[PDB]
């Protein structure tokens, strides 16, 4: 009953009104969202229609508008944008009801829609209004004629933001945010709410980036404090690898006995081209982003070792404290004491990069890193999340970069008793060997399928 909203820090007089409209318990989205919204932080709610988003903000807006009048006009304190006459009215009928048992003082609400005379709406405006619900058109109309004051708005809400963007109102939203001051007279910071029926939507992500301040995402996972992007590594459309000869990364020598010279026109050639390009692409990314810090995930112990040596060739290594390509490695063939020291040197900010394998990273605990680079994608799709999980403090968006080949790459598996040490059997697992044909595009597809979405490409 009304207990279920009171518990979350809702004013009892509001909670009572909510029980009386047959909202007896909160939706999962309301259960999570309201505490956050009362907390004053910016909140992006992403969940299907009918999950209770609109209600999640209808309830606590009244509280927040009330606690700002109790502390201090005629300028509205909260503006809610809806893409519908329909949705504006239901959203207004909610605010009407939940404000029922609030006196000392009462709260003045106003609809703002096409059809109803401005003279009705402007009588209401000149007088004293606290809470505005309306549609982009008249809201744009009535603000850009000097009618509707937004100076003291501390609670902005873009409901059905997906629809609002696809209805072409991005320009509007961005104007409204520029106009509303970022700090209130109270000294407090503008609270922005974004509701979406769609998740993973790029347009809503770009909107969260542009008009929200370190928002909390809410869904009924990808820690969306995280940008992540695929750089395809296509040795057919990038022919850089032909024009180096032997000024490149030391590859894994799976193709030592193979002809990988141009003209070979074999899968073995395209595979060695990839192994060469991943080198160049790793260096370029680090240069372009000017990365202060990153974790770098290689598939194997010697993949790590070979990248450390190439980083050395770039003025870096474990002996160049602070340099752009300063780094340490963390894997099996590293004595366990060297690991502990290598790891503290990374936490100290001695070296910029921590090069490690999935298996070594089980051992590590570390988060809040601004960059991860996946040189190669993980065998198990589950590990993409674990890997990406290590980027992005709440006060700094991280970035995962994944270098994904567009052809199959022959790599080492190793079935031999030696567990790698001294084996060079280039033949396939199938034919008694310690190599397989990796298919990184397929892994990506299984990964994108697991996250039930699409990852941006560059
Ligand atoms: N706690 C609740 N208990 C019962 N019904 C609720 C509750 N919250 C919302 N509803 C109702 O469920 C429907 C969906 O609510 P709404 O907030 O509009 O969802 P959304 O904005 O996610 O589409 C509405 O008819 C609303 O009145
Ligand atoms: Mg709604
Ligand atoms: Zn082997």
Which residue has its alpha carbon closest to ligand 1 atom 7? 23
Tell me if 55 CB under 6 Å of ligand 1.
Answer: yes
- Determine the Cα–Cα distance for residues 455 and 119; give it in Å rounded to an integer: 49
49 is in an annotated binding site: yes
- Determine the Cα–Cα distance for residues 17 and 67; give it in Å rounded to an integer: 18
| Closest ligand 1 atom, residue 94 Cα | 27
Strands (E), 280-384: 294-297, 327-330, 353-356, 371-374
Tell me if 392 CB under 6 Å of ligand 1.
Answer: no
54 is in an annotated binding site: yes
- Determine the Cα–Cα distance for residues 377 and 438; give it in Å rounded to an integer: 10
Task: Give the ligand whose atoms come closest to the C-alpha of residue 417.
Answer: 3
Question: For strand 409-412 and strand 435-438, is the pairing parallel, antiparallel, or unpaired?
Answer: antiparallel
Rounded distance from Cα 160 to ligand 2 centre (Å): 7
Residue reference for tokens 């270098």 = 403
What is the maximum alpha-carbon separation in the chain?
A: 87
- Determine the Cα–Cα distance for residues 420 and 299; give it in Å rounded to an integer: 14
Tell me if 26 CB under 6 Å of ligand 1.
Answer: yes
- Judge contact between 440 and 377, C-beta under 8 A: yes
Strand order in the sheet with 109-112: 109-112, 131-134, 78-81, 155-158, 191-196, 43-46, 216-218
Structural determination approach? X-ray
**What resolution in angstroms, rounded to 1 decimal?**
2.7
Q: What is the DSSP letter of 20?
A: T
Q: Which two tokens stand for residue 174?
A: 């961005």
Buried b (16+ CB within 10 A) or exposed e, 170-207: bebbeebbeebeeebeeeeebbbbbbbbebbbeebeeb
β partners of residue 317 = 326
C-alpha distances out from residue 423 to 332, 420, 429, 457, Å: 16, 6, 13, 37
Look at residues 256, 312, 254, 255 and name the one whose alpha carbon lies nearest to residue 279.
312
- Judge contact between 211 and 192, C-beta under 8 A: yes
Tell me if 320 CB under 6 Å of ligand 1.
Answer: no
């Amino acid at each position: 009953g009304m207990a279920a909203f009171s518990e979350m820090g809702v004013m009892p007089e509001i909670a009572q009104a909510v029980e009386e409209m047959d909202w007896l318990l909160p939706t999962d989205i309301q259960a999570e969202s309201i505490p956050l919204i009362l907390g004053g932080g910016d909140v992006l709610m992403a969940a299907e229609t009918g999950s209770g988003k609109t209600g999640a903000f209808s309830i606590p807006v009244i509280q927040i508008v009330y606690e700002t009048l109790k502390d201090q006009s005629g300028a509205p304190k909260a503006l809610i944008v809806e893409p519908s006459r329909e949705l504006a009215e239901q959203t207004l009928n909610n605010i009407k009801q939940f404000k029922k048992y609030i006196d000392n003082p009462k709260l003045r609400e106003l609809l703002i829609i096409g059809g109803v005379a401005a003279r009705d709406q402007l009588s209401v405006l000149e007088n004293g209004v606290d809470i505005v619900v309306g549609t982009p058109g008249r809201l744009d109309d009535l603000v850009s004629t000097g009618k509707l004051n937004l100076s003291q708005v501390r609670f902005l809400v873009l409901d059905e933001a997906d629809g609002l963007l696809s209805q072409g109102y991005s320009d509007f939203i961005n104007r409204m945010h520029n106009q509303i001051p970022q700090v209130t007279s109270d000294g407090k910071r503008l609270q922005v709410i974004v509701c979406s029926a769609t998740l993973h939507s790029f347009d809503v992500k770009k909107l969260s980036e542009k008009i929200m301040h370190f928002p909390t995402w809410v869904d009924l996972s990808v820690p969306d404090t995280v940008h992540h992007v695929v750089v395809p590594v296509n040795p057919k459309t990038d022919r850089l690898w032909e024009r180096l000869g032997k000024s490149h990364i030391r590859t894994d020598d799976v193709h030592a006995k193979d002809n990988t010279r141009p003209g070979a026109n074999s899968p073995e050639m395209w595979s060695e081209a990839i192994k060469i390009l991943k080198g160049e692409y790793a260096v370029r990314a680090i240069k372009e982003h000017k990365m202060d810090q990153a974790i770098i995930f290689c598939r194997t112990k010697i993949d790590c070792d070979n990248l450390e040596q190439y980083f050395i060739q770039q003025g870096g290594g474990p002996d160049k404290k602070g340099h752009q390509f300063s780094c340490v490695c963390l894997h099996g063939d590293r004595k366990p004491h060297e690991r502990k020291q290598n790891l503290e040197r990374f936490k100290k900010g001695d070296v910029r990069f921590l090069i490690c394998t999935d298996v070594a990273a089980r051992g590590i605990d570390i988060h809040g890193v601004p960059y991860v680079i996946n040189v190669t994608l993980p065998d198990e799709k589950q590990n993409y999340v674990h890997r990406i999980g290590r980027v992005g403090r709440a006060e700094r968006m991280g970035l995962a970069i994944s270098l994904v080949a567009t052809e199959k790459e022959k790599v080492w598996y190793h079935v031999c008793s030696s567990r790698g040490k001294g084996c060079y059997n280039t033949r396939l697992k199938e034919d008694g060997g310690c190599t397989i044909w990796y298919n990184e595009m397929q892994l990506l597809s299984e990964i994108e399928e697991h996250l039930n979405c699409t990852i941006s490409q560059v």
